[PDB]
């Protein structure tokens, strides 16, 4: 038909698709899934980081951690708003997240076993998210791209704080240095998996602008020097510079692990959904109360 042609044209000439505009149903749907999962990620990610708020080593670091968690909730809200401009309801997709019908970033299924894990999440995991998000700043759907710009300005700031917390460990006592190395050892590969496996419609529609491999490559190219600045190692024997391509080549990702993780069989999957479910269920009387009070 003819709508599915002016649309194709708007994508090519880089014009932002707005909510009122016409779009194919498949495009509407894959966007609901992506924006929705992105929103779920902001919300679930609060848990591994929140696990350390009460235990953070200094009031400075504690305050930074609370600020970051506050921002994640905020960004979750922007993304749910953005999802709803496509016709879905936020409590509906939220329930799908609680059911397992919708997913969230795999990285949040890993436990935070030390204070360094928080620094490393702030530095590595958010480093990976920033790469992914900057890349989505020229996504075809206007409300999503604008959200990505807003989020990136704020999030990169927190990622710098993450790195400074890691620098404090790297320049500290021997025990602090070991704490850092251990956290890196446990989070390096899960961070690489965040970008996804090794797309037809998404690239053509300019929802995604770069391939998973492309984005991962640039994360590694930019991260390895930072690892070196800290006097630390990367747990990858096959990591080497390749002067032919001009990129770092690195070892195989364990895709069996990635597949277990996204299918609910990772380290903290059960605990994360149990926590959100329990929060939701036990919160029902509160939401009902707010409803009833408004009706008066």
């Amino acid at each position: 038909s003819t709508q599915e042609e002016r649309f194709e044209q708007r994508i090519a000439q880089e014009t932002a698709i707005e909510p009122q505009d016409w779009m194919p149903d498949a495009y509407r749907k894959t966007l609901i899934r992506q924006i929705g999962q992105h929103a779920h990620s902001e919300i679930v990610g609060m848990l591994p980081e929140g696990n350390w708020i009460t235990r953070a080593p200094t009031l400075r670091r504690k305050a930074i951690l609370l600020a970051k968690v506050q921002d994640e909730a905020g960004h979750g809200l922007y993304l749910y708003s953005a999802a709803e401009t496509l016709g879905c309801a936020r409590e509906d997709i939220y329930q799908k997240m609680l059911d397992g019908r919708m997913k969230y970033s795999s990285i949040f299924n890993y436990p935070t076993l030390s204070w360094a894990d928080i620094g490393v999440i702030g530095w590595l995991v958010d480093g990976a998210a920033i790469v992914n998000q900057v890349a989505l700043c020229r996504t075809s759907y206007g409300p999503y791209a604008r959200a990505m710009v807003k989020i990136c300005k704020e999030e990169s700031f927190h990622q710098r704080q993450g790195f400074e917390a890691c620098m404090a460990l790297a320049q500290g006592s021997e025990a602090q240095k070991q704490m850092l190395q251990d956290a890196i050892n446990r989070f390096w590969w899960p961070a690489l998996m965040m970008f996804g496996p090794n797309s037809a419609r998404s690239l053509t529609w300019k929802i995604k602008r770069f391939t998973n491999d492309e984005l991962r490559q640039r994360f590694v190219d930019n991260t390895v020097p930072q690892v070196e600045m800290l006097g630390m190692t990367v747990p990858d024997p096959d990591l080497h510079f390749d002067t032919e391509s001009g990129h770092y080549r690195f070892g195989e990702i364990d895709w069996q692990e990635f597949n277990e993780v996204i299918n609910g069989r990772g380290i903290c999957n059960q605990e994360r959904l149990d926590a959100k479910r329990k929060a939701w269920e036990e919160g029902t009387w509160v939401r009902e109360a707010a409803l009833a009070h408004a009706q008066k």
Binding site: I43, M46, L47, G50, I53, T54, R55, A56, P57, T58, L59, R60, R61, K62, A63, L66, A67, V69, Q70, A73, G74, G76, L77, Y80, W115, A165, A168, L169, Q171, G172, S173, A175, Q176, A275, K276, K278, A279, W280, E282, G283, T284, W285, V286, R287, E288, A289, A290, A292, H293, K296
Partner: protein, 248 residues
């Protein structure tokens, strides 16, 4: 200058301990919007704690916010008993917030006119935040008390549970009196009228009852706490106690 140090420390300790409690709520609220608000209030309070603790360290001529937070034990903490109460359910948490916010607003309104410049300046920042807090906590007091049958009942149980700790809000000792006579501090006894005016009203507007029990629990200010504080400090101080004198 000793009494001034203790007075500043107390205000920091109230804010610090309440901040810890609110931190436990992260990712466990009934709504995302509430999660955000609780994180925000906790963050404000942490900021006031840092300001009060930093000033306390300056006054004492040694230490900082971190040595005061992480190297004192429960018998050296001077927070109100109210702020160390467990989170319980959301009503328990709202009740505690409300009682503290009313008090903070009454206190900081007056404390920004303190003859001590640094205390005045801290209070001037604090009051702005405290007003937002009171709006949030009073808001939910209304929504829960005047909500469903179930919610109003939980809100009443919450107020009853905390009530006895409210006496400490208006308890004055040698430190308070000496400093109020110098126009530096507020005499807590003189905060009762403004506090009761707000809280009695809010409880009534929420279709609830002000408890008839006369509040009788004090001790926090002199380092005499409930059995709650100890386990809180164990969690909070763990890392600093395992690896002391370090930079983070």
């Amino acid at each position: 200058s000793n009494q001034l140090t203790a007075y500043t420390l107390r205000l920091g300790d109230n804010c610090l301990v309440l901040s810890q409690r609110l931190g436990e709520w992260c990712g466990h609220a009934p709504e995302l919007e509430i999660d955000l608000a609780l994180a925000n209030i906790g963050l404000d309070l942490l900021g006031q704690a840092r300001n009060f603790l930093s000033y306390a360290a300056e006054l004492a001529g040694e230490g900082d916010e971190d040595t005061l937070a992480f190297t004192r034990d429960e018998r050296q903490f001077s927070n109100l008993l109210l702020v160390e109460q467990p989170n319980g359910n959301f009503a328990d948490t709202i009740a505690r917030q409300y009682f503290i916010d009313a008090w903070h607003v009454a206190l900081f309104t007056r404390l920004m006119e303190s003859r001590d410049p640094q205390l005045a300046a801290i209070s001037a920042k604090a009051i702005k935040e405290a007003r937002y807090h009171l709006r949030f906590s009073r808001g939910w007091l209304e929504r829960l008390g005047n909500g469903t049958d179930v919610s109003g009942q939980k809100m009443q149980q919450a107020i009853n549970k905390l009530w006895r700790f409210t006496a400490e809000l208006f308890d004055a000792d040698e430190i308070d009196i000496a400093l109020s006579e110098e126009g530096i501090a507020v005499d807590p006894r003189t905060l009762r009228a403004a506090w009761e005016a707000e809280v009695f009203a809010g409880i009534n507007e929420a279709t609830l009852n002000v408890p008839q029990e006369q509040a009788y629990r004090t001790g926090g200010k002199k380092g005499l706490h409930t059995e709650h504080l100890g386990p809180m400090l164990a969690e909070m101080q763990y890392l600093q106690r395992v690896l002391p004198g370090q930079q983070w």
